[PDB]
Amino acid sequence: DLGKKLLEAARAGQDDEVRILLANGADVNTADETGFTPLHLAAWEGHLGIVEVLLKNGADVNANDERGHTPLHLAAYTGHLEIVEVLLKNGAGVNATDVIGTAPLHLAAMWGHLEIVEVLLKNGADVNAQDKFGKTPEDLAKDNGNQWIAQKLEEAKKEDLDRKLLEAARAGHRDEVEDLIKNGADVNTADETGFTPLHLAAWEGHLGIVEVLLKNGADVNANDERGHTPLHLAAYTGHLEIVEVLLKNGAGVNATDVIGTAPLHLAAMWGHLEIVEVLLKHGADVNAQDKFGKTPFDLAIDNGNEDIAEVLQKAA
């Protein structure tokens, strides 16, 4: 009956009695009739001291009860922020669900535990997880009156939809892009360096996605942190058909980055003759110097692109 005495001590919060019982051979993973273990109970009542002890003595951080509740489900239910951080620390399942489909984030967002919510998200909690009733954490927050947590969850949702749109744009998944847009993703979002979905599509040469993004209000002249526009990226990677659509949709043909390089500079240095001819036809300044002083002609000569040098020398 050591199991009963360990369950009791864990619930009451008797730190020493927990150690005395474990030392005398108590099974750290015993369970009452419903399925709660010594860890479940210590997490339900908030005894951080016994939590750390039990984990250190071989407790299963992810034990389930009859209804599929885990220790993390409980600590998130009772608002004990310190215990949640430690359960995750030992490999607790941030997205473990119960028979109803409820995850810890459903619980921390239903009982107004702002800190626990942002801690769960940082560890990978899914804001779009739906329970058996079709409720996400954001739905339960609005049903109870936690409006700040609801906004935070909305923020994380848009943050996640934007990341997906950037990746879909890079990878060339026209279907995912168009659906992400129809779900409210910002076509103008930007990663840490300032690349928008239209930057990535032009860089990778996915013409179909360039067109879609532009038809949905994408900033054709958006600048990354280095001052590059999508046209800069299409010109130097050599995607002729994208350059034409970009220019047809308002692309500044004389945009300059932090180094003072225009698209013509990049097309001439990388040796894309057709794009050089198209840029000139659309108004590119043939004589433009970058901050170091080089013209596109000098860059073509530097790289042995004689055809390009000829065309630039004639347009000058």
Numbering used by the authors: 13 to 328
Q: What does the published report state?
A:
In the context of DARPin-β-lactamase fusions, we observed that the paratope of this DARPin has a high propensity to form major crystal contacts, leading to crystal formation under a wide variety of conditions. Indeed, constructs D12_Hxx_D12 with H02, H09, H11, H13 and H15 yielded diffraction-quality crystals in space groups P212121, P6122, P212121, C2 and P1, respectively, at resolutions ranging from 1.8 Å to 3.5 Å. Only three of the D12 constructs did not rely on paratope-paratope interactions, but instead relied on paratope-capping repeat or paratope-connector module interactions as dominant crystal contacts: D12_H11_D12, D12_H13_D12 and D12_H12_D12_H12_D12 (P21). The propensity of DARPin D12 to engage in crystal contacts is so large that, where the crystal geometry does not allow for its preferred interaction, alternative interaction geometries are observed. These are found as paratope-paratope interactions, interactions with the DARPin N- and C-caps, with connector modules or with the target protein of a second DARPin in the construct.
In this paper, we present a strategy to fuse specific, high-affinity protein binders to obtain multivalent or multispecific scaffolds of predetermined geometry. DARPins are used as building blocks to confer the desired specificity to the construct. A series of rigid connector modules replacing the DARPin capping repeats allow to combine the individual DARPin domains in such a way that their distance and angle can be altered to test different geometries, bringing the binding partners of the DARPins into a defined spatial arrangement. The two helices are not just joined end-to-end, but instead the two domains are made to overlap in such a way that the joining helix is stabilized by contacts with the domain cores along its entire length.
